[PDB]
Amino acid sequence: EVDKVYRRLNQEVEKSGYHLNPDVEFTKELVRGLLANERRYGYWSCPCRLSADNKEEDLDIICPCYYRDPDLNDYGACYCALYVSDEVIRGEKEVESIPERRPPREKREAIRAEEASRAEMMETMEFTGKLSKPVWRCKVCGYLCAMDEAPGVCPICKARKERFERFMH
Amino acid sequence: EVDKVYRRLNQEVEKSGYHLNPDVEFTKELVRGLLANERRYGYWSCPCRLSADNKEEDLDIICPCYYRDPDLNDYGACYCALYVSDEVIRGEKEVESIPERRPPREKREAIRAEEASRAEMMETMEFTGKLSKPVWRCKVCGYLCAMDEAPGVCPICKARKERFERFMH
Amino acid sequence: EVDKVYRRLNQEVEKSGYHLNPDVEFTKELVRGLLANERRYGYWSCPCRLSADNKEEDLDIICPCYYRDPDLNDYGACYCALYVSDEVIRGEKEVESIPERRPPREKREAIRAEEASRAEMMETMEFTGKLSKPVWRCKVCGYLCAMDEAPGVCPICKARKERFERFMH
Ligand code: SF4
Ligand code: SF4
Ligand code: SF4
Ligand SMILES: [Br-]
Ligand SMILES: [Br-]
Ligand SMILES: [Br-]
Ligand SMILES: [Br-]
Ligand SMILES: [Br-]
Ligand SMILES: [Br-]
Ligand SMILES: [Br-]
Ligand SMILES: [Br-]
Ligand SMILES: [Br-]
Ligand SMILES: [Br-]
Ligand SMILES: [Br-]
Numbered sequence: 001e002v003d004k005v006y007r008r009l010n011q012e013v014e015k016s017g018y019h020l021n022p023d024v025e026f027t028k029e030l031v032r033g034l035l036a037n038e039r040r041y042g043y044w045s046c047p048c049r050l051s052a053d054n055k056e057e058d059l060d061i062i063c064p065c066y067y068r069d070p071d072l073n074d075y076g077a078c079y080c081a082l083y084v085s086d087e088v089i090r091g092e093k094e095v096e097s098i099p100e101r102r103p104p105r106e107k108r109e110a111i112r113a114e115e116a117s118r119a120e121m122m123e124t125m126e127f128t129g130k131l132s133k134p135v136w137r138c139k140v141c142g143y144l145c146a147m148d149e150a151p152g153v154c155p156i157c158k159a160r161k162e163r164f165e166r167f168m169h
Numbered sequence: 170e171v172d173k174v175y176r177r178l179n180q181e182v183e184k185s186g187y188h189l190n191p192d193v194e195f196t197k198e199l200v201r202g203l204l205a206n207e208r209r210y211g212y213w214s215c216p217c218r219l220s221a222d223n224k225e226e227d228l229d230i231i232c233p234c235y236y237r238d239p240d241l242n243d244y245g246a247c248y249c250a251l252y253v254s255d256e257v258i259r260g261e262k263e264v265e266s267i268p269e270r271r272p273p274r275e276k277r278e279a280i281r282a283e284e285a286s287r288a289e290m291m292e293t294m295e296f297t298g299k300l301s302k303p304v305w306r307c308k309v310c311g312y313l314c315a316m317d318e319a320p321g322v323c324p325i326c327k328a329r330k331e332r333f334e335r336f337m338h
Numbered sequence: 339e340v341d342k343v344y345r346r347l348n349q350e351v352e353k354s355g356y357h358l359n360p361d362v363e364f365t366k367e368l369v370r371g372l373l374a375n376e377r378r379y380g381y382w383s384c385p386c387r388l389s390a391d392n393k394e395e396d397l398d399i400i401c402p403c404y405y406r407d408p409d410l411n412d413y414g415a416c417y418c419a420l421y422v423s424d425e426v427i428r429g430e431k432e433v434e435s436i437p438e439r440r441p442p443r444e445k446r447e448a449i450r451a452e453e454a455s456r457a458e459m460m461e462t463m464e465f466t467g468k469l470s471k472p473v474w475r476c477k478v479c480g481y482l483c484a485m486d487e488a489p490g491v492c493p494i495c496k497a498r499k500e501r502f503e504r505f506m507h
């Protein structure tokens with residue numbers, strides 16, 4: 001039907017140094033699957049896995065999935081064998097059985113929640129150091145305050161802004 | 170009516186080295202506004218801004234607002250020009266148009282939530298290092314435990330409290 | 339009735355260098371209390387304190403409680419005087435009145451929530467450094483990526499996996 005998607009994929013991955021399975025009809029088969037999965041669930045859900053029909057919960061199995069590279073590295077193929085390793089293509093690598101590396105649902109949920117908290121921390125802290133203010137010190141009385149710029153005049157001794165200095169530490 | 174509040178303000182700010190607008194009637198005008206805003210919303214909501222009639226959401230525009238000092242520094246006046254800069258009062262500073270520095274509602278909410286998380290972290294950690302316990306080491310068997318004081322006797326070898334030592338590291 | 343529990347306790351604590359009150363009948367009294375509290379609430383709630391009949395909220399007063407050791411250290415006895423200090427048993431230590439060290443309900447709740455946040459941080463961060471990936475660098479073009487192992491081939495220059503190196507810093 002559409003061979004268009006097969007070929008544009010083959011070129012997309014070859015540029016980046018990955019490889020599709022060299023057997024053509026088995027691969028185009030998987031392509032049909034991916035297409036159908038896109039029609040049915042609205043994302044490219046791994047063609048050889050049960051989709052949960054919820055994108056958020058499947059982000060790890062949208063093709064290419066999070067298991068592809070480790071699986072290529074250990075077994076010479078991704079779980080469906082859509083992709084095969086640079087080693088298999090040539091010789092060595094001996095394309096072989098691939099266990100399911102994806103963790104079970106409960107485990108995945110824990111991992112996500114942990115990545116959520118971790119991202120929130122990093123966000124909050126990055127956003128933080130962005131709004132922090134430098135500390136200014138009056139050179140007459142030593143008054144300290146925290147502002148982008150030193151105040152017009154020291155509320156203590158009245159020295160002008162230009163007589164403050166950035167303070168450390 | 171009440172000029173009482175005008176004058177007590179003028180003295181309150183002059184002590185700290187800020188200045189009210191030298192035009193008297195324009196300033197007392199703003200004072201009336203602030204008073205009314207206090208009657209209407211129960212806080213001194215910036216007289217030249219739309220109040221949301223919720224204190225929590227307006228903490229940034231209670232007068233004096235969070236934009237006053239940066240605005241004095243850049244434009245020689247706060248957004249309403251209740252306050253004018255030390256430079257304008259004398260010469261230079263050329264009192265000039267002030268854009269609205271306050272971010273729009275969505276932005277403000279994000280910023281607040283980020284300051285909330287940041288404060289929770291800092292709180293939780295400060296509260297944390299306060300309850301942490303030192304580590305005590307039996308000098309006979311090396312048993313380690315974490316308590317304000319070493320135990321009456323080592324549960325391992327039975328050496329008395331006075332034969333423990335603070336441990337590092 | 340059951341003296342079984344009295345004696346197994348006396349041996350359990352003596353091994354660890356704690357001591358029960360040497361008056362036998364006052365102690366076995368407290369034992370009966372602890373038993374009853376176990377029948378009534380399903381945990382060994384301090385026999386001389388009001389139980390809230392909720393384990394989660396009483397974790398600090400399950401016997402032995404969190405106040406036992408500090409109380410032994412300062413007063414020579416736990417709050418009920420189930421336990422007496424190594425000093426009292428012999429001489430010195432002068433067993434004496436013990437105030438209630440447990441903080442009031444509101445305080446306890448705050449402390450717990452703070453320990454919760456602190457534990458979540460530590461968990462999230464520990465779980466974090468466990469999933470972080472090393473950074474690999476192509477030795478031909480300097481391409482950087484973060485994975486357990488370097489890719490089959492550099493998506494940039496095509497150098498094979500074995501021509502990458504662990505990168506710092
Ligand atoms: S396993 Fe192969 S096919 Fe299934 S998603 Fe991962 S990469 Fe795409
Ligand atoms: S702008 Fe001027 S008047 Fe309005 S709140 Fe800030 S300081 Fe008070
Ligand atoms: S006070 Fe004494 S009896 Fe009550 S719980 Fe703490 S240790 Fe057990
Ligand atoms: Br079709
Ligand atoms: Br998608
Ligand atoms: Br990998
Ligand atoms: Br590869
Ligand atoms: Br497989
Ligand atoms: Br100046
Ligand atoms: Br400076
Ligand atoms: Br009036
Ligand atoms: Br107020
Ligand atoms: Br400023
Ligand atoms: Br000023």
Ligand SMILES: [Br-]
Pocket residue numbers: 247248249250266267268269
């Ligand atoms: Br303005």
Ligand SMILES: [Br-]
Pocket residue numbers: 329330331
């Ligand atoms: Br001692």
Ligand SMILES: [Br-]
Pocket residue numbers: 333334335
């Ligand atoms: Br010591």
Ligand SMILES: [Br-]
Pocket residue numbers: none
């Ligand atoms: Br009974």
Ligand SMILES: [Br-]
Pocket residue numbers: 380381382400
């Ligand atoms: Br229990």
Ligand SMILES: [Br-]
Pocket residue numbers: 316317318319407408411
């Ligand atoms: Br202690």
Ligand SMILES: [Br-]
Pocket residue numbers: 320321322355356357410422423424425
């Ligand atoms: Br003791």
Ligand SMILES: [Br-]
Pocket residue numbers: 416417418419435436437438
């Ligand atoms: Br007591």
Ligand SMILES: [Br-]
Pocket residue numbers: 498499500
């Ligand atoms: Br290789």
Ligand SMILES: [Br-]
Pocket residue numbers: 502503504
């Ligand atoms: Br290396």
Ligand SMILES: [Fe+3]
Pocket residue numbers: 138139140141142143154155156157158159
């Ligand atoms: Fe000063």
Ligand SMILES: [Fe+3]
Pocket residue numbers: 307308309310311312323324325326327328
């Ligand atoms: Fe010891």
Ligand SMILES: [Fe+3]
Pocket residue numbers: 476477478479480481492493494495496497
């Ligand atoms: Fe390269």
Ligand code: NA
Pocket residue numbers: 043062
């Ligand atoms: Na996607």
Ligand code: NA
Pocket residue numbers: 103104105106
């Ligand atoms: Na599952």
Ligand code: NA
Pocket residue numbers: 133147148149239
């Ligand atoms: Na500032």
